[PDB]
Amino acid sequence: TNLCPFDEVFNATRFASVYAWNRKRISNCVADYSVLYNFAPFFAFKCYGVSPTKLNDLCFTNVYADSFVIRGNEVSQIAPGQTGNIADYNYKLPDDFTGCVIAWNSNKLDSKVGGNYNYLYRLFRKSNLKPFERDISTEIYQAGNKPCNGVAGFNCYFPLRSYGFRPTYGVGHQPYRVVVLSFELLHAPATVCGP
Amino acid sequence: SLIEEKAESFLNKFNQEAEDLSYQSSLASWNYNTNITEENAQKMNEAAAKWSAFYEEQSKIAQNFSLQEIQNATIKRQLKALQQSGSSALSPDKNKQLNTILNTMSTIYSTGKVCNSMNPQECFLLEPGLDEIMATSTDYNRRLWAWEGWRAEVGKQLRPLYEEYVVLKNEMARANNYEDYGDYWRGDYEAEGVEGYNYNRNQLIEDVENTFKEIKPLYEQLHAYVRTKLMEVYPSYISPTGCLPAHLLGDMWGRFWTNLYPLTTPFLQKPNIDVTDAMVNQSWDAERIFKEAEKFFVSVGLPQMTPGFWTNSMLTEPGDDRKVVCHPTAWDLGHGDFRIKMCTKVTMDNFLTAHHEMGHIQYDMAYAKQPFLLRNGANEGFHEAVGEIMSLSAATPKHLKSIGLLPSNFQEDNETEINFLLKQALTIVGTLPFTYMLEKWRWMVFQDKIPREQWTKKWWEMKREIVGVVEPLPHDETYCDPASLFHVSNDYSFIRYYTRTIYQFQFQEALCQAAKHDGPLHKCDISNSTEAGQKLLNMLSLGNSGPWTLALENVVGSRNMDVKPLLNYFQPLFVWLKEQNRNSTVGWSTDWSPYAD
Ligand SMILES: *[C@@H]1O[C@H](CO)[C@@H](O)[C@H](O)[C@H]1NC(C)=O
Ligand SMILES: [Zn+2]
């Protein structure tokens, strides 16, 4: 057998920021759901378009794993058909989504006394993001008629901002890790199957 | 339109920066308070400096947006709150002069010393010796000379400074488009917004006046009961048909009348209710008091404490090589962190104080979801009103029976109820008119109404007219009596106590009638009532977003304050006082003077 690698997505030391999430494609391997239940808490485990109960009979062509780190309050915004900051400027899911969203706490590893300022999120954008689209541009935002001309100031702002987690914040502001599994069945031989 | 988006973006950036900056400053402050060290004080200083500078810069830059152009009913309030930082709208020289004089007044009040005529070696300070001698003494002469020395030392050094502080404060207020400084203080209570709940500053005086007209009939009766009793200790001095001496009220300024209790207690046969012996026998712990308080708070449906509350907050004295200033406080450091600091001891007073602080924490948790600039109370007195009503509900005898400290077969006696009501009256009704009169005097002096050369005479004329306190010695115009109080010398407002006293009894009556209770109002509990918790939480979560009139209508159902609940609360005491005072007279005359022959 050739087991699908559900280790780099669930045991990785470092996770990327929201505005540049990590995408991994997997095919032609053996998928097992027992490895998925590797962590006891599973604060959020929500599945759309598939049976949450054990269903390995269905075989798909491609499986996509999208990983990032968000706050506790924004976990409810990773859903099909939601409005907000993260769901409108950072990461958007379509209405025909068929997959599963998993979110679990990571305070013990992503919190420092001084503050972890590596994680970032985008705050200003001209137009809402299309589904499954990422933006990594860092031009200076311009909300005014006067041209900004490449310098911050009045009515000129820098898009990206930092979280800065600490290990005494509340449960709602603690760092959480989110992984989304998407299943795609294109016109191709079936590759991903069960044991 | 085009400006709404700009205002929204500016507010978003301001909130994003302000949350982190305020959390850093508050964390540094708590770190200093937990352990006193020069390093902690320094770190607190640089923590506060950056916050002040950023706030000043944001307030300066926020004025570029016109108020009338925008309309959102939520952005306008935030921008108005941010722009109202005109304390810097003065020329720098006047700013330095005002800061220097404020520092000088505060320091000279802190370092005040009074020495004895017989021997200049002792020179008693305020905290070590003056308070205790003013609280638990009996000799007339010692109180008289201590009072006179304190008043002289304070006034002769504080009058000229206050005379110039007033002018600079008036200039500062006028630089911010205000009539005077009294308007600046009264601008906290102004509520503008949806139609029907509009509140103007100028009404705040008139309403207060009306309230006083319903407190006088009860207060006078109390003034009788003390007076006769005060003639037992001091036979020759106090006259039946006159007022009361200033230094015989049991306190340095006569603000509270609690210390008169051992001399004016009605019944000496049985003591009050103290369950400290039950706690000692039952082997209670500091954590148990807070657990019981949390259980009481949960019993009405309010959310329980966070799992960081027990781990982070300190609830017991360290008892080792650590230095902590002892004062019960509730800290809302931001970013969903809440703490209480308290030198907990096994005694009923600490139990009630824990209830008060937990009420503060519950309110802070309740209004957390609002934006940063509106993350405060509706007015000044709401926090303390909530704390007081929680303490009053927690201190009842039936609650103590339910806990188990008191025996099940209890025979409550009416005399104990009368004693408790007398203590509560001495705590509240004794201090209400003093607050009213001091606030009125300050309001009149700021409005350029009372002349510069008739300050003390008018002060004592009002003191003899309203409260009924007569000076034992005559004071020349060089003295400055009002400067002897902490709030006057340190530039704090004073009407918040009056407003909180009015509000707390309305809240108590509303929660009691929502809790399906009948009978006397001083035996009521809000416990085991989800309706009362829902009614309270419907208001506790509004915060500063809307006018306080809407919140008050949500709680009690009235647009304005009322004083009838206090009278309903104290009705049995009023009846007993009228019953006892048939022989004596009611009221005082302004003709008496003790030093006059
Ligand atoms: C995988 O997760 C657990 C965490 O305790 C542990 O086996 C190890 O630290 C992680 N990494 C591996 C096995 O490479
Ligand atoms: Zn308090």
Tab-separated table of C-alpha atoms in Angstrom, chain A residues 2-190:
chain	number	residue	atom	x	y	z
A	2	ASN	CA	0.940	3.690	-0.355
A	3	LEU	CA	-0.624	5.833	2.368
A	4	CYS	CA	-1.495	9.457	1.688
A	5	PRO	CA	0.830	11.851	3.584
A	6	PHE	CA	-1.377	13.363	6.284
A	7	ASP	CA	1.675	14.274	8.358
A	8	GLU	CA	3.096	17.408	6.724
A	9	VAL	CA	-0.361	19.009	7.010
A	10	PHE	CA	-1.119	18.081	10.646
A	11	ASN	CA	2.298	17.938	12.374
A	12	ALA	CA	4.149	20.798	10.665
A	13	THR	CA	6.233	22.947	12.998
A	14	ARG	CA	5.403	26.211	11.201
A	15	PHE	CA	2.192	27.353	9.513
A	16	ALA	CA	1.912	30.139	6.955
A	17	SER	CA	-0.024	33.380	7.345
A	18	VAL	CA	-3.656	33.879	6.359
A	19	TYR	CA	-3.037	36.038	3.288
A	20	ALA	CA	-0.587	33.417	1.935
A	21	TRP	CA	-2.036	30.048	2.930
A	22	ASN	CA	-0.376	26.709	2.199
A	23	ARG	CA	-1.910	24.524	-0.522
A	24	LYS	CA	-0.956	20.875	-1.037
A	25	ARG	CA	-2.353	18.580	-3.729
A	26	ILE	CA	-2.482	14.809	-3.232
A	27	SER	CA	-3.512	11.984	-5.557
A	28	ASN	CA	-2.767	8.310	-6.361
A	29	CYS	CA	-2.336	7.342	-2.698
A	30	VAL	CA	-4.222	5.553	0.102
A	31	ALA	CA	-6.314	7.730	2.416
A	32	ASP	CA	-7.213	6.728	5.977
A	33	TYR	CA	-9.436	8.694	8.350
A	34	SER	CA	-7.904	7.136	11.481
A	35	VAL	CA	-4.781	9.294	11.145
A	36	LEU	CA	-6.997	12.394	10.994
A	37	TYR	CA	-8.243	11.860	14.571
A	38	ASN	CA	-4.747	12.489	15.908
A	39	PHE	CA	-5.687	15.324	18.300
A	40	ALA	CA	-8.267	15.016	21.071
A	41	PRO	CA	-9.809	18.551	21.175
A	42	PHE	CA	-10.940	19.268	17.585
A	43	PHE	CA	-12.610	22.532	18.551
A	44	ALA	CA	-14.107	22.818	15.054
A	45	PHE	CA	-14.884	19.860	12.781
A	46	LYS	CA	-17.488	20.702	10.138
A	47	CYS	CA	-18.122	18.860	6.869
A	48	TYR	CA	-20.231	19.932	3.881
A	49	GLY	CA	-21.225	17.770	0.933
A	50	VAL	CA	-19.958	14.525	2.500
A	51	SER	CA	-21.025	12.316	5.385
A	52	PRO	CA	-19.287	13.298	8.653
A	53	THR	CA	-19.709	9.669	9.681
A	54	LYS	CA	-17.020	7.306	8.401
A	55	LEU	CA	-17.365	7.137	4.606
A	56	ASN	CA	-14.247	5.921	2.784
A	57	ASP	CA	-16.141	4.179	-0.033
A	58	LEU	CA	-16.172	7.243	-2.288
A	59	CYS	CA	-13.090	7.641	-4.486
A	60	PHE	CA	-11.920	11.035	-5.755
A	61	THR	CA	-9.336	12.306	-8.229
A	62	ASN	CA	-7.615	15.137	-6.327
A	63	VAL	CA	-7.528	16.177	-2.670
A	64	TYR	CA	-6.441	19.690	-1.691
A	65	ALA	CA	-5.243	20.604	1.805
A	66	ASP	CA	-5.211	24.311	2.681
A	67	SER	CA	-3.523	25.243	5.961
A	68	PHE	CA	-3.252	28.533	7.847
A	69	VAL	CA	-3.476	30.099	11.320
A	70	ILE	CA	-6.267	32.467	12.392
A	71	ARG	CA	-7.800	33.722	15.628
A	72	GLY	CA	-10.538	32.029	17.623
A	73	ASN	CA	-13.323	34.449	16.707
A	74	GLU	CA	-12.626	34.171	12.964
A	75	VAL	CA	-13.038	30.369	12.897
A	76	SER	CA	-16.757	30.799	12.204
A	77	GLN	CA	-15.850	32.904	9.145
A	78	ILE	CA	-14.244	29.946	7.315
A	79	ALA	CA	-17.544	28.740	5.864
A	80	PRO	CA	-19.373	28.842	2.511
A	81	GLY	CA	-21.435	32.016	2.298
A	82	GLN	CA	-20.071	34.264	5.045
A	83	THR	CA	-19.233	37.962	5.298
A	84	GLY	CA	-16.384	39.474	7.287
A	85	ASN	CA	-12.755	40.545	7.125
A	86	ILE	CA	-10.937	37.228	6.645
A	87	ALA	CA	-13.712	35.794	4.460
A	88	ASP	CA	-13.694	38.863	2.176
A	89	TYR	CA	-10.044	39.977	1.962
A	90	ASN	CA	-7.961	36.895	2.848
A	91	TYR	CA	-9.636	33.544	2.118
A	92	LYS	CA	-12.981	32.836	0.438
A	93	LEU	CA	-14.860	29.565	-0.106
A	94	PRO	CA	-17.510	28.976	-2.800
A	95	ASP	CA	-21.149	28.041	-2.302
A	96	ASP	CA	-20.728	24.635	-4.001
A	97	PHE	CA	-18.022	23.612	-1.517
A	98	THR	CA	-17.748	19.869	-0.810
A	99	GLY	CA	-15.139	19.313	1.868
A	100	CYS	CA	-14.275	19.537	5.541
A	101	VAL	CA	-12.931	22.265	7.839
A	102	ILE	CA	-10.872	21.406	10.931
A	103	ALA	CA	-9.689	23.940	13.506
A	104	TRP	CA	-7.815	23.311	16.750
A	105	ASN	CA	-6.051	25.347	19.415
A	106	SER	CA	-2.336	26.131	19.160
A	107	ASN	CA	-1.684	28.428	22.129
A	108	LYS	CA	1.102	26.275	23.594
A	109	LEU	CA	3.236	26.616	20.436
A	110	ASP	CA	2.273	29.915	18.738
A	111	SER	CA	2.333	32.264	21.752
A	112	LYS	CA	5.306	34.093	23.261
A	113	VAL	CA	5.600	36.447	26.222
A	114	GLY	CA	7.042	39.249	24.108
A	115	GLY	CA	4.714	38.573	21.185
A	116	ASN	CA	4.780	36.561	17.950
A	117	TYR	CA	4.645	39.224	15.234
A	118	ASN	CA	5.368	36.945	12.260
A	119	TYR	CA	1.708	36.188	11.529
A	120	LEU	CA	-0.007	38.794	9.354
A	121	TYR	CA	-3.409	39.541	7.854
A	122	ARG	CA	-4.698	41.979	5.247
A	123	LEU	CA	-6.982	44.801	6.372
A	124	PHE	CA	-7.677	46.916	3.262
A	125	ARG	CA	-8.521	45.843	-0.282
A	126	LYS	CA	-10.210	47.458	-3.272
A	127	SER	CA	-12.560	44.577	-4.133
A	128	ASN	CA	-13.618	41.286	-2.577
A	129	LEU	CA	-11.611	38.172	-3.399
A	130	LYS	CA	-12.903	35.488	-5.733
A	131	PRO	CA	-13.108	31.954	-4.297
A	132	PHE	CA	-9.825	30.039	-4.006
A	133	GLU	CA	-7.810	33.138	-4.937
A	134	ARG	CA	-4.799	34.515	-3.065
A	135	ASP	CA	-3.230	37.981	-3.120
A	136	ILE	CA	0.315	38.720	-1.944
A	137	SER	CA	0.687	42.268	-3.256
A	138	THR	CA	1.814	44.969	-0.826
A	139	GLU	CA	1.052	48.233	-2.623
A	140	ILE	CA	0.021	51.235	-0.541
A	141	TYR	CA	-3.745	51.495	-0.118
A	142	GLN	CA	-5.405	54.637	-1.505
A	143	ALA	CA	-8.825	55.652	-0.162
A	144	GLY	CA	-8.676	59.275	-1.336
A	145	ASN	CA	-8.844	61.256	-4.553
A	146	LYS	CA	-5.372	62.726	-4.025
A	147	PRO	CA	-2.724	60.393	-5.509
A	148	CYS	CA	-0.756	58.549	-2.848
A	149	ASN	CA	2.434	58.452	-4.968
A	150	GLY	CA	4.100	55.648	-3.057
A	151	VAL	CA	4.204	57.130	0.449
A	152	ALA	CA	2.084	56.528	3.542
A	153	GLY	CA	0.258	59.346	5.288
A	154	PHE	CA	-3.187	60.919	5.404
A	155	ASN	CA	-5.732	58.665	3.659
A	156	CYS	CA	-2.815	56.380	2.746
A	157	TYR	CA	-2.399	53.078	4.567
A	158	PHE	CA	-0.339	49.881	4.538
A	159	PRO	CA	-2.566	46.810	4.000
A	160	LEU	CA	-0.907	44.111	6.101
A	161	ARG	CA	-1.011	44.061	9.906
A	162	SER	CA	0.188	41.672	12.611
A	163	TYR	CA	-1.547	39.588	15.279
A	164	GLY	CA	0.991	39.616	18.111
A	165	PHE	CA	-0.223	36.728	20.257
A	166	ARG	CA	0.499	36.416	23.973
A	167	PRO	CA	-0.034	33.585	26.423
A	168	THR	CA	-2.490	35.422	28.702
A	169	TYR	CA	-4.964	36.577	26.080
A	170	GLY	CA	-8.445	35.100	26.257
A	171	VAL	CA	-9.671	31.996	24.478
A	172	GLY	CA	-11.210	34.111	21.715
A	173	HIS	CA	-7.914	35.820	20.836
A	174	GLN	CA	-5.686	32.739	21.167
A	175	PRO	CA	-4.029	31.347	18.016
A	176	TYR	CA	-5.896	28.561	16.219
A	177	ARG	CA	-4.718	26.358	13.344
A	178	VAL	CA	-7.136	25.606	10.494
A	179	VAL	CA	-6.878	22.970	7.755
A	180	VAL	CA	-9.450	22.622	4.962
A	181	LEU	CA	-9.785	19.476	2.845
A	182	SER	CA	-11.367	19.869	-0.603
A	183	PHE	CA	-12.274	16.936	-2.856
A	184	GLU	CA	-12.313	17.273	-6.649
A	185	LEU	CA	-13.460	14.613	-9.130
A	186	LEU	CA	-12.425	15.703	-12.622
A	187	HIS	CA	-12.692	13.754	-15.890
A	188	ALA	CA	-9.738	11.469	-15.169
A	189	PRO	CA	-9.040	7.994	-13.725
A	190	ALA	CA	-9.960	7.674	-10.059
